[PDB]
Amino acid sequence: MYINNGRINYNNEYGYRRGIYREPFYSDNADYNTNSKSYYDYLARFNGFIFELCDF
């Protein structure tokens, strides 16, 4: 998601961050404990690259 020397390449970093608490699974924040929210949030990974590609 960065332009180096006038060339743009998309690298997928895999920095690992671990949280101590397990996800509650019973809090009202997790609605229905379904799958779709993950699919909705996946495509936000490409926003910075999309903006930089549009500028390029």
């Binding site: 961050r17 924040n29 993950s38 949030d41 996946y42």
Partner: protein, 313 residues
């Protein structure tokens, strides 16, 4: 608006069924660990000793050390007060105090101590060697590991029945027939009388979906769960035979063997036999007993009221 956690780039998630399966498995593993650990904590507290004020022994450390398998030594120190000397190491001629691996501060170490022996009517000596069991052929923690496997499987079945047992009412109709939404709105609220046409057919188009196992599977599984906990306790020293005798329960009525669980409790009571040698050398009355009862506010009131004990099943 609604609240959700901040976006963390985690990738796609597996469906709800896989989440539920992993949650059930993790619950089973957690229960097994919890019950094994809790039995480990409960073990040292089973046997208790009378007349603790007589000597400075700190019986709790003694019981813990015995349960981990040490050959604890108790006896008179340089102060002249009976206390837990160091544990004997390695070897099972009279022990001349050079074999004790002392744990007391340095100034409280007897210059000349001799093990009390059954020769000489235990009338001469300084210390006493205690072992957990008179003859030991079993690792007591292996028995706990043996039954926690059987307890973990039952919980895995009992929890799976809780998550499975969910009931619902299912309406069958065309995919967007707006009569159903109106019908549900009336039915959920108060509606003694609902008027429809012949094509909704309430007898067969409305089907109740149940667990099909609530009547029998849930009841029979708890019966078998309590059996396994009963077998675990009887195998170890854990028992409630004092209350069972008063209540009048029987071997057939309560699915257990009194004679079997009685002898298991005797294994550790007779392990503390060397305390009679201490009782005979110094004029003391220290007698091990099973800690059957945790004293309660009602028990204290019952003793004063004199209305104490009883109850026939």
């Amino acid at each position: 608006n609604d609240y959700i956690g901040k976006n963390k780039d985690v990738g796609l998630k597996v469906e709800l069924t896989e989440d539920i399966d992993r949650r059930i498995m993790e619950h089973r593993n957690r229960f097994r660990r919890l019950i094994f650990n809790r039995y480990v904590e409960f073990l040292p507290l089973l046997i208790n000793y009378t007349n603790q004020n007589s000597v400075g022994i700190d019986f709790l450390q003694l019981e813990i050390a015995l349960r981990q398998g040490y050959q604890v030594v108790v006896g008179k120190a340089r102060n002249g007060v009976i206390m837990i000397l160091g544990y004997i190491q390695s070897m099972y001629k009279r022990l001349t105090q050079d074999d004790i691996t002392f744990i007391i501060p340095d100034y409280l170490r007897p210059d000349y101590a001799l093990e009390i022996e059954y020769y000489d009517n235990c009338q001469s000596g300084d210390f006493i060697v205690l072992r957990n069991k008179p003859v030991n052929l079993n690792n007591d923690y292996q028995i706990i590991e043996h039954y926690c496997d059987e307890l973990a499987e039952i919980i895995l079945s009992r929890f799976s029945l809780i998550m499975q047992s969910k009931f619902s009412k299912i309406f069958l109709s065309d995919i967007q027939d707006e009569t159903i939404n109106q019908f549900i709105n009336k039915l959920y609220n108060g509606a003694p009388f609902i008027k429809t046409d012949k094509y909704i057919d309430p007898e067969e188009d409305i089907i109740d979906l149940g667990s099909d196992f609530v009547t029998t599977a849930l009841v029979e599984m708890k019966r078998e769960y309590q059996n396994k906990v009963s077998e675990l306790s009887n195998f170890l020293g854990v028992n409630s035979l004092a209350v069972d005798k008063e209540s009048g329960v029987s071997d057939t009525e309560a699915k257990s063997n009194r004679s079997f669980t009685t002898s298991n409790s005797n294994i550790y009571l007779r392990g503390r036999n060397p305390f009679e040698m201490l009782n005979r050398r110094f004029n003391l009355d220290i007698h091990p007993y099973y800690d059957d009862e945790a004293i309660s506010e009602m028990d204290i009131m019952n003793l004063k009221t004199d209305n104490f004990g009883g109850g026939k099943v």
